[PDB]
Ligand binder design. Sequence first.
Ligand SMILES: Cc1cn([C@H]2C[C@H](O)[C@@H](COP(=O)(O)OP(=O)(O)O)O2)c(=O)[nH]c1=O
Ligand SMILES: Cc1cn([C@H]2C[C@H](O)[C@@H](COP(=O)(O)OP(=O)(O)O)O2)c(=O)[nH]c1=O
Lengths: 135, 134
Amino acid sequence: ENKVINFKKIIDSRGSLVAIEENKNIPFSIKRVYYIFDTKGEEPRGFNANKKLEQVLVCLNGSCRVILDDGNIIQEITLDSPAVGLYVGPAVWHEMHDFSSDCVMMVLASDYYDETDYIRQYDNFKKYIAKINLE
Amino acid sequence: ENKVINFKKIIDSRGSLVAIEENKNIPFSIKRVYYIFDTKGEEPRGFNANKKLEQVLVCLNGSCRVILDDGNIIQEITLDSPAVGLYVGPAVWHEMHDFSSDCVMMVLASDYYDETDYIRQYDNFKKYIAKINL
Ligand SMILES: Cc1cn([C@H]2C[C@H](O)[C@@H](COP(=O)(O)OP(=O)(O)O)O2)c(=O)[nH]c1=O
Ligand SMILES: Cc1cn([C@H]2C[C@H](O)[C@@H](COP(=O)(O)OP(=O)(O)O)O2)c(=O)[nH]c1=O
């Protein structure tokens, strides 16, 4: 609704195609594009949040289960269609679970990588939130 | 000229990661990302060149065989690895073939989709270049 993104997909005799255009079908400017592949193992990914960064998650192949928490509510959504993007805003905790063996997960980011934008501790994250409420 | 870009790739028990950053590891600013999937049939694609667009192609899954003509040299390249990107500069002809079934192909473009920037006559492409040569 506010988080789930339905990208317009095109289909022909040849296949499918999806195009994402910076600040057209995504609320921000693209500066970085990262992706995860050749996954394996039972240990998740993510479990962190970001102060400034805005992102959009997309399961290009296979599937992945992702959790969300803006401190308030928690949401879960299983990405399994390249045509769907998930919006992860700043100040939103995230987790990437259950990567299918063939999963390819892509992320469109508003800025370059920067370890100091991270909130990797749940409590601080929570903390971070409350503080915020006050202001 | 080689047009291949090899991205640094992180590795751990979890899998692999590759990160592409506008103007950092790719000679241009990203304005659009598009990908092709659920491909079928025996028809290739591409077959055009762009006068202003700068792209980078990445085969995120499976594989695909690419042909790039810069007007000086033709290069055929099989992409079967997400950590390799091919740079398709302006006035560079390209074609995608041999898409595996599970093939997922991705393109990073320096600009929005503009049909008018597209040359779809190889011959014309060849001419445009010559002209360019002056
Ligand atoms: C997402 C991302 C990660 N990285 C680096 C940070 C780490 O050195 C590594 C893995 O990222 P991440 O999964 O966040 O690391 P960690 O194992 O601590 O959870 O990749 C970049 O360099 N650029 C990026 O865009
Ligand atoms: C690559 C791309 C395609 N499309 C559309 C154009 C077409 O209607 C469809 C796929 O077409 P395309 O791959 O460009 O080739 P062709 O015109 O020969 O069919 O997707 C966009 O809207 N934006 C893009 O960035």
